[PDB]
Symmetry: D2
Subunit: 208 residues, 4 copies
Amino acid sequence: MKVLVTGFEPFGGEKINPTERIAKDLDGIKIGDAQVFGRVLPVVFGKAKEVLEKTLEEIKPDIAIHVGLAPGRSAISIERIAVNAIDARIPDNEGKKIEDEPIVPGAPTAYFSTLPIKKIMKKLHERGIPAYISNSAGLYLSNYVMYLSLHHSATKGYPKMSGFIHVPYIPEQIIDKIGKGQVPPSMSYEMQLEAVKVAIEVALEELL
Amino acid sequence: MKVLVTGFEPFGGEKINPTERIAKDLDGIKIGDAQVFGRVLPVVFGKAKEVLEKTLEEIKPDIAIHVGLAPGRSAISIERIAVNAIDARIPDNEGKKIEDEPIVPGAPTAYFSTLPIKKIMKKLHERGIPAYISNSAGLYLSNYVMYLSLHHSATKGYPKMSGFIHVPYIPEQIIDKIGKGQVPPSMSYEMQLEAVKVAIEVALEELL
Amino acid sequence: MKVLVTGFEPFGGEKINPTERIAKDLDGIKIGDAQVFGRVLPVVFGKAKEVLEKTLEEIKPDIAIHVGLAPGRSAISIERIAVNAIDARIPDNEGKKIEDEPIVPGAPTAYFSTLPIKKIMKKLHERGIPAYISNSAGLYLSNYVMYLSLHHSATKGYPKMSGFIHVPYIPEQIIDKIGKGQVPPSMSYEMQLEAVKVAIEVALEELL
Amino acid sequence: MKVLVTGFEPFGGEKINPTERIAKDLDGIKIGDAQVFGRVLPVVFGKAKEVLEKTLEEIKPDIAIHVGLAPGRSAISIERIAVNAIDARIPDNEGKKIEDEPIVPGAPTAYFSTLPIKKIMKKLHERGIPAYISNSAGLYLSNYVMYLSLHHSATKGYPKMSGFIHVPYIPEQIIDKIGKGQVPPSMSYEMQLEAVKVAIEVALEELL
């Protein structure tokens, strides 16, 4: 068994992206006889697609779990659907702002996550980790990779399972926000890392 | 040096109140040569006043830090002011619902917290703990005790410092909320307990 | 030219549904040489499908604009995508609660709205009406009808344009909410009705 | 009978302040045998105090209702208390940023609004206008004037009634916010103006 976990670099002014640590922290660990690979993707259209495709092609994971930062969200959110579209509210890390454009022309309008999202959520609740199902991963880079991953799956037959998980800001990221007159929700890094491992575990239990 | 920390029992349907554990967890510990006392107050008008008065009178703390649950708040909030009024949106744990009534007739309309609130907040930020200054502790039991405590201070000369701190829901309390179609902010119990100790420490450093 | 506008009856305990009045208010009016038909759909799975199919089949509209109540949303929201799924958080008006089930088995995972959503939004802004693009209409009845409508469109060739618009609570609906300790956003009925007419107009300008 | 209504000029980057129109719109009108005076105050510490004091001294109102913009609030909010403190998160329109400073040294920590706030709220509800009681008017200019007004009242014996009312953004102000990736609540200008007249009316009915 091989599992691929990806995270994203900082973006939109944020100095950190909790998903970057998550990916690095999970890279190389083993859960049962399953080997986990952690890779950090750039918040850049195009380049991110290349890194993703090469990684999937090089590792050929059975399961692919992509994690991203969802500023403002109060709990762990498991994405149910990836849509074939890009409409960036802000530019990516290269300065490009793509608006109303398909990710893969002619490809399906959308793909359902193949991760056992309800069991993952239920398992997190048992661990006392707030989590829910999101029906939109935005139309920025998180959705971008989530879509490409599921498309690769429907196209090449692997990974067997692919999905996306969004995590809230970690506490320390809230500090400089307070000054700007507003305090968004946060979740400790430990609970976030824990949530992803749980997701991997439930995914492994399910996959075959 | 003697420090008094209070918490509240569950209320409003909640099965737990993180401040109850905090009080019990801090009871009996020593921070430097300072003895900390932890007491859980009932979410009941009148009865809560008696317990508070007796405790203050029995222990005669130099510092009094009262902690409560603020459902919906996303970070640690340090109260700046206690108002001489009661206007309960819901009844207390005894079924009574007091509306537009003074706490202490003839007493001052309000009292400023005597805790070094700005330093406490600043110290929490350094620890990476989101925190801010709240200018209203509500008009329920949190405000009730905060007011009575500061009134006891202005009246008897002790404690020298008195204030109130509100904490968010802890993660596990969010689980059953998700079903009811809504996910409020939360903060891990560990960070909450930590925040209170920090507050105590900064208070001790300040007090004399 | 024929335009079909639908609304929903009250649901989830709400005594009113602003979209019901909207539909009734727009029924029978003419915008240019375009005849508008307003119909109120029941917040009931299955039954709602029948009413929708019959209405579309009987009127055979060139444009179909379905409106619904989105409790909590602060401005007019134009839906970008309808997904082939049902996962009701609450039961419908008949007491049934469908979870994780497709709307049309074997049908596409999702459909993009064919209404000129960006122009509609832009036109509303010019009128000073807050509006934005929503990328998820929920998985309750709004999404249900939005999907069925676009599926009917891809299947029968009509209507040429189909989409969904969610409106906030109208002010009067907020009154009894205040007691329950919370005040959600609202938008006056007049602005809501106005927004829908604008949408119809932009749709007509676009359609051919 | 004489009633004084004040509003504020634009501030914090906002190009408009709905309270400015409200004041101008109500200036000179008569409600029964009561003469209403509408004055716009500058969002400037010090200068605002002078304008307020001169106005109160020149008109010597029986009732003083001060209105302000509360960005983000979803309904009409009637302030219950004014605190003797300034802690500006942002500078005023002259560039000054006052932090942790009393408004009137030696004066009471706080003043309760003398307007019949509960009746005003109840009357607005009957009109279908969402409204609630706020227990904090912030520590910026709204609180500043609210305090000074009630202090003038306790000091000079007039006005007999003084209070503050905060209104949400009006719809048009939300338009350019949408771009910045966020849509706060709003309330039509008409409902806002209406709410203030109601407040004046209830105040008149009450005052003597």
